[PDB]
Motif scaffolding. Sequence first.
Motif, PDB file in Angstrom:
ATOM      1  N   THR A  86       9.359  10.968  21.744  1.00  0.00           N
ATOM      2  CA  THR A  86       9.092  12.341  21.294  1.00  0.00           C
ATOM      3  C   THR A  86       7.960  13.034  22.037  1.00  0.00           C
ATOM      4  O   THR A  86       7.971  14.251  22.203  1.00  0.00           O
ATOM      5  N   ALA A  87       6.981  12.268  22.488  1.00  0.00           N
ATOM      6  CA  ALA A  87       5.777  12.901  23.008  1.00  0.00           C
ATOM      7  C   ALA A  87       5.224  12.325  24.314  1.00  0.00           C
ATOM      8  O   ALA A  87       4.109  11.804  24.348  1.00  0.00           O
ATOM      9  N   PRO A  88       5.989  12.451  25.402  1.00  0.00           N
ATOM     10  CA  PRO A  88       5.594  11.853  26.676  1.00  0.00           C
ATOM     11  C   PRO A  88       4.317  12.491  27.194  1.00  0.00           C
ATOM     12  O   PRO A  88       3.532  11.879  27.943  1.00  0.00           O
ATOM     13  N   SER A 111      -0.806  10.832  29.303  1.00  0.00           N
ATOM     14  CA  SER A 111      -1.895  11.174  30.221  1.00  0.00           C
ATOM     15  C   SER A 111      -3.285  11.070  29.580  1.00  0.00           C
ATOM     16  O   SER A 111      -4.326  11.208  30.259  1.00  0.00           O
ATOM     17  N   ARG A 112      -3.298  10.834  28.273  1.00  0.00           N
ATOM     18  CA  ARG A 112      -4.535  10.749  27.527  1.00  0.00           C
ATOM     19  C   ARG A 112      -4.954   9.301  27.456  1.00  0.00           C
ATOM     20  O   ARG A 112      -6.047   8.987  27.001  1.00  0.00           O
ATOM     21  N   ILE A 113      -4.068   8.426  27.922  1.00  0.00           N
ATOM     22  CA  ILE A 113      -4.289   6.983  27.890  1.00  0.00           C
ATOM     23  C   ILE A 113      -4.321   6.374  29.294  1.00  0.00           C
ATOM     24  O   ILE A 113      -3.268   5.978  29.824  1.00  0.00           O
ATOM     25  N   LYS A 114      -5.522   6.281  29.874  1.00  0.00           N
ATOM     26  CA  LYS A 114      -5.671   5.918  31.277  1.00  0.00           C
ATOM     27  C   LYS A 114      -6.481   4.648  31.482  1.00  0.00           C
ATOM     28  O   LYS A 114      -6.229   3.916  32.419  1.00  0.00           O
ATOM     29  N   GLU A 118      -3.732  14.450  15.158  1.00  0.00           N
ATOM     30  CA  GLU A 118      -2.845  14.719  16.308  1.00  0.00           C
ATOM     31  C   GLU A 118      -1.513  15.251  15.837  1.00  0.00           C
ATOM     32  O   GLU A 118      -1.246  15.223  14.646  1.00  0.00           O
ATOM     33  N   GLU A 119      -0.670  15.732  16.746  1.00  0.00           N
ATOM     34  CA  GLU A 119       0.614  16.333  16.327  1.00  0.00           C
ATOM     35  C   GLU A 119       1.681  15.299  15.905  1.00  0.00           C
ATOM     36  O   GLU A 119       2.737  15.639  15.371  1.00  0.00           O
ATOM     37  N   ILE A 120       1.387  14.031  16.153  1.00  0.00           N
ATOM     38  CA  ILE A 120       2.198  12.932  15.643  1.00  0.00           C
ATOM     39  C   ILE A 120       1.344  12.085  14.686  1.00  0.00           C
ATOM     40  O   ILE A 120       0.119  11.915  14.879  1.00  0.00           O
ATOM     41  N   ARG A 121       1.978  11.566  13.643  1.00  0.00           N
ATOM     42  CA  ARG A 121       1.231  10.849  12.630  1.00  0.00           C
ATOM     43  C   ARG A 121       2.011   9.738  11.956  1.00  0.00           C
ATOM     44  O   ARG A 121       3.245   9.768  11.891  1.00  0.00           O
ATOM     45  N   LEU A 133       7.711  17.776  18.349  1.00  0.00           N
ATOM     46  CA  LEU A 133       8.529  17.986  17.160  1.00  0.00           C
ATOM     47  C   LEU A 133      10.025  17.846  17.373  1.00  0.00           C
ATOM     48  O   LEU A 133      10.724  17.308  16.521  1.00  0.00           O
ATOM     49  N   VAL A 134      10.543  18.335  18.487  1.00  0.00           N
ATOM     50  CA  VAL A 134      12.000  18.263  18.661  1.00  0.00           C
ATOM     51  C   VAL A 134      12.455  16.859  19.059  1.00  0.00           C
ATOM     52  O   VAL A 134      13.584  16.454  18.763  1.00  0.00           O
ATOM     53  N   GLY A 135      11.557  16.131  19.727  1.00  0.00           N
ATOM     54  CA  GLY A 135      11.808  14.760  20.139  1.00  0.00           C
ATOM     55  C   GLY A 135      11.930  13.876  18.922  1.00  0.00           C
ATOM     56  O   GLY A 135      12.644  12.882  18.921  1.00  0.00           O
TER      57      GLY A 135
END
Length: 661
Positions: A416-418, A422-425, A442-445, A463-465
């Motif tokens: 859903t949220a590729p 980029s926040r995980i490096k 965050e927008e996922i929970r 959301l659509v994912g």
Amino acid sequence: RAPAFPLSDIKAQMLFANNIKAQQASKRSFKEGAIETYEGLLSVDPRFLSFKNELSRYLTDHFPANVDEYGRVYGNGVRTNFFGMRHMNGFPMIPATWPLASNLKKRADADLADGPVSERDNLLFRAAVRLMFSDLEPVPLKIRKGSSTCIPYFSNDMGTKIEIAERALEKAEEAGNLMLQGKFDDAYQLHQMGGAYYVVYRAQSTDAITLDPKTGKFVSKDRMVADFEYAVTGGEQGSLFAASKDASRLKEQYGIDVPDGFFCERRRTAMGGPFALNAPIMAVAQPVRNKIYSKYAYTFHHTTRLNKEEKVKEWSLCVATDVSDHDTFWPGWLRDLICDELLNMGYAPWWVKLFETSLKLPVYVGAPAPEQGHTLLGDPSNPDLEVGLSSGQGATDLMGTLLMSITYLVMQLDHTAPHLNSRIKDMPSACRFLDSYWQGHEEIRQISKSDDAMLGWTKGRALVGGHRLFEMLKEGKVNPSPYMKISYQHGGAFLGDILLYDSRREPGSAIFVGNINSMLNNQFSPEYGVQSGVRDRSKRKRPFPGLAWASMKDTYGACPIYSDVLEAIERCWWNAFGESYRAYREDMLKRDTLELSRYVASMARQAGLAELTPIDLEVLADPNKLQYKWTEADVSANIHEVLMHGVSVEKTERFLRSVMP
């Protein structure tokens, strides 16, 4: 292949000390028979059974399941039939599973990963380890009254238990260093750290039963088991097969009248850890629970039906998931990882070694069936077994929670949220992210506890994912994870509260209600008898059964058909006994309310239940619920002291400081 010694072998004998409790444990033969459902009423009493044959049929008829195509539950709240109650509580299927000594083959045949598949996943697991085991404050090591130290003593004396824990906290270090050295026998002989888990078979009072419209006969959900040769080989040799839930054998064996459509109970395997070795683990595990239930409470700390409701009312999509056979699938590697990551954070090696070992331990099989068991699996001289997540371990819930919270988050990034990847490096960025994710910022929970979880998406890119993922589950031809076998709950609910969708079918206009079927389980299919032979009620598996009636309305009362089901009972009870259930349960209430004031200090000699949370009641009625549904924080301080008793904090503190960084 796995080493296996008989009770006669020295390696078996060395597991039980030179005393009666223990020796009886080693020999313990198949045990089976009726339970005292309530005081002076037998689970198989023909009057009670009739009440069950009637109440089951009636409720199933006049209230079938309201669960839509997307496993959402609406209307009446009922998510299945009521035929669960139709068991001869106290009689197992023959035989119960032998426990599998290695899940490696099981896992590969099920197409699951042998380690983190991506370098990102590798970061997220190790991040969880750091957030969870980071800044811990020392608390008292709380112990449960009337619980077995198991190997090698099998004591029950709260006296002897403390002396054992206190000892094990001093000699924990010396014992770990002993194992880092490969002297496992030595550590076990000097401090009872090692040996094996003891396999007890707890029962599952209520399992699937259905009615075949064609034949008119009843059908019990087959439950697959392993025989010995299957268990030692990892699945290679030996066979799997359904166990004999048929309850007919009772009419000839004990001449008990068995009505049509009644079967034996499902027996789940269950383990008891060498306490010597659980004590140092709980001394850390409990402070851990405290951190994530505070700082990360959004996703981990859950209380009432409205505590949950507040969080999920803000979601645009709510997907309720459901893991298959979580415990025997738990990956050996997650352990080796969590251990390696702890070593790096700067945990004492000796403690980490004790932790590592509590997960690779041999298991003593008690008695699965008549003429069976009495066998130790795996050599305790060199703990190598891969049993899954062992149910009696000092930290079982944490190991389940850490594995799954990261699994669900991964399943969320993946599908859903590729854009978040980029926040995980690196390690710090990994952490900074997880920390935000777990706080619900965050927008996922997710809200979860081990294998129960609900996943949520707010308005946004992901959301659509989310809807696609959900769709992949409804279709369910592909597994959305590499790590475990996931899917959607049919008629979704979270920690025994059902999610009531309205016409909208939206997480903004839905509510959490009590599971009505769980009331019928707690009241007519309890897991243990009243134990009227045990003086000290705080040691009984159900200290004050009658109290559950006070907190009943408060718990299930939100259920749509609450009103109806109580009347259904009352009438069906009347038909079958010539009495008012309500009355019965009311008398039983007054009795235990008084009995309690003896166990409660500050209360007493007749003061009533005024000062008690509904939780407090449910918990005093089934302290087993304190061990999966709630925790020490959720229970009034004084009530807590009835069921548990702790070790001085001056002692945990001093110990915790030699473990941590």
